């Protein structure tokens, strides 16, 4: 076939698997020792810039997926058991639970323009500025139906601690930054106050907390520890409030300081933190959902109980 002739004849992917006699003679450690010399360096000595200086600057930065890059993160080390569960059992249950049938040839829905125009015969109308969002000042996102092309999922999680008393005892912030480090496995970013309140002794623009964000698998593994090891151990816990939700598919709730020390990562070395310095955190679960009821349905599928509030 002429099409097959245009393919590379010297295909390395069609070669046989290596043999054993050669594998028994392949000893990368014996080569170094026997050589008794340093192999000459290669003339290709390009190293990623430490600053991106523009699209057309002679030296360019490689993509993050390049191992030699400065922002390369080793790939997945394991499959989170909550991501394989959701995809294997719960992905279809949500799809079957929330499914509305569309007739075969239903005409496509034309989305209405939310910034209305002034339309009429009056001369002034023509060049009037578009009308304001009817109702609320900011436009709320519209809800998407749960179909086989849109199944809610967890995207990221942001854990944050606000320690106002750290403006007097600077040791409370150092401890908080180490807890959020072991709890999530990342390097938190310190945050600063924004308002001035004398009654609460709050001063603006001074470091009074930290935050962390975990994406991908680390977000699923953080939920497995929370749902199945931490929350069951909280004394007299009722559940996540039914009012949680920002109206866009994100769930938020907070943990007490005595519930943050129940984390397996914080309890093992509980004696290395000063007494009464372990803080409480705010957990904001960000999902791909587009509604408050889609988010609470997603969490219910992961085994999170809710209570009336």
């Amino acid at each position: 076939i002429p099409d097959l002739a245009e393919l590379e004849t010297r295909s390395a992917l069609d070669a046989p698997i290596p043999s054993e006699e050669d594998k028994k003679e392949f000893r990368p450690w014996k080569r170094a020792a026997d050589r008794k010399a340093r192999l000459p360096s290669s003339r290709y000595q390009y190293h990623p810039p430490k600053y991106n200086r523009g699209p057309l600057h002679p030296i360019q930065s490689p993509p993050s997926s390049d191992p030699i890059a400065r922002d390369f993160v080793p790939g997945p080390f394991n499959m989170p058991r909550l991501k394989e569960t959701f995809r294997t059992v719960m992905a279809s249950d949500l799809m079957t639970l929330a499914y509305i049938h569309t007739p075969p040839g239903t005409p496509k829905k034309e989305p209405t323009e939310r910034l209305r125009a002034w339309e009429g015969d009056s001369p002034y109308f023509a060049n009037r500025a578009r009308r304001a969002p009817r109702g609320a000042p900011e436009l709320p996102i519209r809800e998407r139906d749960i179909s086989f092309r849109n199944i809610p999922e967890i995207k990221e999680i942001t854990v944050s601690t606000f320690v106002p008393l750290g403006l007097k005892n600077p040791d409370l912030l150092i401890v908080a930054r180490a807890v959020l480090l072991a709890m999530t496995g990342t390097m938190p970013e310190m945050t600063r106050s924004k308002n001035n309140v004398v009654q609460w002794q709050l001063q603006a623009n001074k470091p009074a907390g930290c935050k962390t964000t975990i994406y991908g698998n680390a977000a699923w593994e953080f939920m497995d520890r929370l749902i199945h090891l931490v929350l069951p151990r909280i004394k007299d816990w009722k559940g996540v409030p039914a009012s949680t939700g920002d109206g866009s598919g994100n769930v938020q709730f907070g943990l007490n300081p005595e519930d943050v020390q129940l984390f397996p990562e914080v309890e093992c070395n509980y004696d290395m933190y000063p007494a009464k310095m372990i803080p409480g955190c705010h957990i904001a679960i960000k999902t791909t959902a587009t509604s408050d009821r889609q988010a609470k349905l997603l969490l219910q599928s992961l085994g999170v109980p809710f209570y009336s509030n």
Binding site: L7, E8, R10, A12, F26, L39
Partner: protein
Amino acid sequence: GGPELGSRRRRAALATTGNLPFEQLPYQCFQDARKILQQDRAAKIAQIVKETEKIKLIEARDASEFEGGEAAKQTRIKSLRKYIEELKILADINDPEVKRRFEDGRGDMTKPVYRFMAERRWRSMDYKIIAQRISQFHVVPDLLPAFDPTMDVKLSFRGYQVSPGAILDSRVTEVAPTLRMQVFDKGERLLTVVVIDSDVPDVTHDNFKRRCHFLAANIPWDPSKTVLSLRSVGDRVEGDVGKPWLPPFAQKGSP
């Protein structure tokens, strides 16, 4: 162990290590990763034979059968042909030695794969800087209404590579330059080279006129040719020189 084998590291690594093809190195992940791409390339090659035979059926099909006639039959083979060209590139885009061959400059430009990476490399950097020269120097709309380059052209004067839009000395630009061209589509074509000076000052009428400093036509070019010396355009390489190279100049005072 001579310079014909490569660099010092290669000639050194080629005498202190064992003789074994790169793809046959006994590494676990590299051999498990090369088996996934192996049985996938067989699935792409198995798809090119399924789409290749699917065109014959459509080729040997009376146009009357198609509710759209010959208009709907040529737009269906059009998508099938374009789907096969993409499969021929996806069958070797994961090959480790195809990437090594192309990076070493030893790539066969008569195959769709190598022409795909060569174009993907040109667009990455050289295209961006040339797209800027056409705009900032107002080549468009002065010379052409709109112009989007589709091939690479690197000109060097007396061996020295000159950057695009670089003020060169009048002695340097006294001999015909050498064009290091590169085309990214298949087939052989005839090329026409034209060097135009767009700022010749006309003092009598208070405006600028254009002057041709070189013109040639009927220059065959395939994606395997790289260098073209404008000096021997009718002696060595086939072509018709309408106007030989005129040494660029600029009278004192003018921009």
